[PDB]
Structure 1
Amino acid sequence: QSACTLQSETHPPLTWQKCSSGGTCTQQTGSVVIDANWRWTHATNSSTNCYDGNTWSSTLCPDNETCAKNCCLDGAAYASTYGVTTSGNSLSIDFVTQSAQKNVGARLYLMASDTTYQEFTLLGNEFSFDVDVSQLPCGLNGALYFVSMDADGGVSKYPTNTAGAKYGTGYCDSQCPRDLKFINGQANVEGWEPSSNNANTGIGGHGSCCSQMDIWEANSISEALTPHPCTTVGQEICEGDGCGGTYSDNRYGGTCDPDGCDWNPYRLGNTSFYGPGSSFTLDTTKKLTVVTQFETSGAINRYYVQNGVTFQQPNAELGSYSGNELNDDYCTAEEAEFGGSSFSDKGGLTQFKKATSGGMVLVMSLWDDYYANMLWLDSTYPTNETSSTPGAVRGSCSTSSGVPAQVESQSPNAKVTFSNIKFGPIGSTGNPSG
């Protein structure tokens, strides 16, 4: 797709800190850009929409190539249309924003410049951020994660994409999302199937895969940490059900691991660690700091800070495993106890180290789940299972919670605030900010 300028594109600024082993942290100035899927897509020579509701214009978009040549992405009014605002080192995303139309959530990327994404090499480093999930009830997910996207949004690889990172192109993740309107410089009109439960989305004939590090997927009820390896580390197009993931039929027939080796304290047995109120170790009605360390062995460590008190990831006992570190032993024990083989089949933490050894783009989003109502994160899943079934209970939310239409009408003012992002060598982010 190309870019149009009927609406100016001004990326909201966002500062963050880069720390060093020497003990100092320096302020960096970046900005955020909203994903292309949320943008107005119209004809290059007019205001005629190329996509409307959950269907494409059959005249402007008869096929993927023609559609890409006839259509362009336009600018976004961050605050008024998407409910996205920034203030210093803080970023807030509103759940539902009512303007000329109804907008639900957003997916944003941290930029290095006005035309490029900031790339982070995670291996041997740690990532820290403060978050306020107090306004996120059951069914919502304020996520912060990393994906192996190209810095230019794919412009160098796909000439027909001239919008680039400036317009949030090039997304990919372990689910090999087929709901993307543009992939590899072409539209996704071929094989398009409008969603039967969402009037604004659909599924196309192609998806976009890549490694994904889910550092934070959470609400006020539950939180999970999940690395997702792929046989091909970087962004790669997939076709049909060969994509696997949520959007396809055979979930495990793809190149990526849609499940991952997840770590949810509640799912692992500690039901008093994270929750709303003073009866929980970490009170989700108050802000908290989340630190994630990527050691060179490929293992992942995590600790939290609230009101100046530090709490390491709680200890978990799963089969022959015992500890608080996400490593090979943990992931092997999880597949043995909870079932599955997707993570190991995709290479596990060893294959995932290839992703963290390279650059990954920071993503921050807020979304509700039209496929599984976020039950996999904060409830019993599958819903037919009981508490006696290992790993079935992931949170205290009712199995009837998370209906998109219901949460959107009942909790429109829900929102998430991410702030004070710090990145640097392991052991450096707790030092004085500059």
Structure 2
Amino acid sequence: QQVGTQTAENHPKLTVSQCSAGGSCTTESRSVVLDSNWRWLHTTSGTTNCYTGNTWDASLCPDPVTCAQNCALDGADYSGTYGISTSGNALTLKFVTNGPYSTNIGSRVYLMSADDTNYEIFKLKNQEFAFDVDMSNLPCGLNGALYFVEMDADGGLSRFPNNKAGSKYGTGYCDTQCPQDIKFINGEANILGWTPSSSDSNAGTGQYGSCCNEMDVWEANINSAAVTPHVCNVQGQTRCSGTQCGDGDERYDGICDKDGCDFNSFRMGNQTFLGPGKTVNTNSKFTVVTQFLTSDNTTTGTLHEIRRLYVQNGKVIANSKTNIAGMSQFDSITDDFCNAQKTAFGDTNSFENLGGLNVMGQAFDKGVVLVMSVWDDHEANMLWLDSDYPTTSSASTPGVARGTCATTSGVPANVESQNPNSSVVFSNIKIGPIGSTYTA
């Protein structure tokens, strides 16, 4: 994709922190960028859209390469068009942003580095990541996500000749769902066999998907939360097609683990731990601390454990323990835990099959990009996060019940109509050595 020059691109500023052993943190000038899929896409000018709604202009895009060559991503009106705003160290992502001719649903942004051109690269092994979240405005069917993906620092600028836009315009997204809704993958328009969605006027899918390792630190709404590593048998952002994308029917055939090895306190058998008025009280702001422990506690150790702590109202809250029949007590993610839970829940252990935490830590060594988003789920209505899933399964079968939301909740059309003013606020982002990001 080329660079559109109709509208200046200015990344909303966001202050984050870097912490040292002992607890001293310093502030850092960073910013956020909107994912390229949301952007206006058009010719150099004479200005005609290359894409609108869920269809392409076939004259400008007769093939993937010509399309990338002809088509330019433009600047974004962050607050007024996309409902994205920042104040100090806080990012607000609004769910539905109405306009005269269209409605914007959700958003996805990436944290920019100090240079405001390339994405910030995080090296998470032997490190701790903290942030504060307010989910009071995220009901059933919504997801305020903070996570990491193995994107290129330049979003594909240097790798792909016909990507001339790069990270400044939020290109190069990938994750373990290997999304095929992505418009540009590998500097080529994803138009081969393009199918406009019959149930979503904003989305289509092409032949290709964009896959990479993903650490889901936080997928949550007021009701429930999950922390979930996912791995792939490929290194970095990789284009897939056919069975490798593991689309729908061939979910467990592809190159990435779509389910991931998840820790949802409610799913792991503690229904009183997290939610409105619970131990971690989702009616108010709280801190989420995530520690990435290695085998020998060095930066070259194998990633061996992912621990979680919360901090609310000045109190440090230890993660809940698993409470599943036949299953041992774990309060953290280890390869051992992953084997145990996939077995206990009768799930395909793709996480371990594709190399488990070792492979995840190797992604961390290469480097990962920080993603923040708000979204609804056109695939499974967010039921996997906050309800009973599969809906056809017994609600008392271990692993089925993930939250208190109704199996009829989270239909996109319904939540967009009924809960348009939903929002998530992520704030006070911190990175440093284990034990440095929070006060005991």
TM-score band, normalised by shorter chain: over 0.9
Q: Cα offset for 1:22?
A: 4.8
Q: Cα offset for 1:85?
A: 0.4
User: Does residue 1:359 correspond to 2:361, yes or no?
Assistant: no
Q: 1:417 aligns with which of 400, 421, 425?
A: 425
1:190 matched to which residue of 2? 192
Give distance in 1, aligned partners of 2:7 and 2:344: 53
User: Does residue 1:315 correspond to 2:321, yes or no?
Assistant: yes
Q: 1:284 aligns with which of 282, 305, 327?
A: 282
Residue correspondence of structure 1 range 80-91 to structure 2 within 5 A: 80-91=80-91
Show CA shifts across 1:203-253 (max 9, x none).
110011100000000000010000001111311111133211xx4431111
User: Does residue 1:373 correspond to 2:373, yes or no?
Assistant: no
Show CA shifts across 1:24-66 (max 9, x none).
2111110000000000011122321111111111111111011
Q: Cα offset for 1:400?
A: 0.2
1:28 matched to which residue of 2? 28
Give distance in 2, aligned partners of 1:365 and 1:320: 33
1:325 matched to which residue of 2? 332
Give distance in 2, aligned partners of 1:90 and 1:271: 30
Q: 1:343 aligns with which of 314, 328, 351?
A: 351
Give distance in 2, aligned partners of 1:242 and 1:260: 16
Give distance in 1, aligned partners of 2:439 and 2:360: 29
Q: 1:175 aligns with which of 151, 158, 177?
A: 177
Show CA shifts across 1:349-381 (max 9, x none).
122121122210000000000111001100001
Unaligned runs of 5+ in 1: none
Residue correspondence of structure 1 range 143-182 to structure 2 within 5 A: 143-182=145-184
1:203 matched to which residue of 2? 205
Give distance in 2, aligned partners of 1:185 and 1:111: 20
User: Does residue 1:52 correspond to 2:52, yes or no?
Assistant: yes
1:234 matched to which residue of 2? 236
Q: CA RMSD in A?
A: 1.2
Residue correspondence of structure 1 range 215-230 to structure 2 within 5 A: 215-230=217-232
Which stretches of structure 1, 4 residues or longer, exceed 6 Å deviation after superposition? none
TM-score w.r.t. the length of structure 1 is: 0.97
Letter in 1 for 2:349: S
Give distance in 2, aligned partners of 1:93 and 1:136: 11
Residue correspondence of structure 1 range 72-83 to structure 2 within 5 A: 72-83=72-83
Determine helix, strand or coil for the equivalent of 2:154.
Answer: coil
Give distance in 1, aligned partners of 2:391 and 2:151: 34
Q: Cα offset for 1:177?
A: 0.7
Give distance in 2, aligned partners of 1:65 and 1:334: 45
Residue correspondence of structure 1 range 290-301 to structure 2 within 5 A: 290-297=288-295, 298-301=304-307
Q: Kindly indicate whether the alpha-carbon contact (under 8 Å) linking 1:85 and 1:93 is maintained by their aligned counterparts in 2.
A: yes
Give distance in 1, aligned partners of 2:163 and 2:248: 25
Give distance in 2, aligned partners of 1:254 and 1:385: 25
Determine helix, strand or coil for the equivalent of 2:122.
Answer: strand
Give distance in 1, aligned partners of 2:97 and 2:89: 22
Show CA shifts across 1:235-272 (max 9, x none).
1111133211xx44311111111011000000011101
Q: Cα offset for 1:337?
A: 0.7
Give distance in 2, aligned partners of 1:240 and 1:47: 35
Show CA shifts across 1:282-335 (max 9, x none).
111100100000011321000101101111111114434212121111101011
Give distance in 2, aligned partners of 1:314 and 1:22: 26
Q: Kindly indicate whether the alpha-carbon contact (under 8 Å) linking 2:270 and 2:323 is maintained by their aligned counterparts in 1.
A: no
Give distance in 2, aligned partners of 1:431 and 1:398: 37
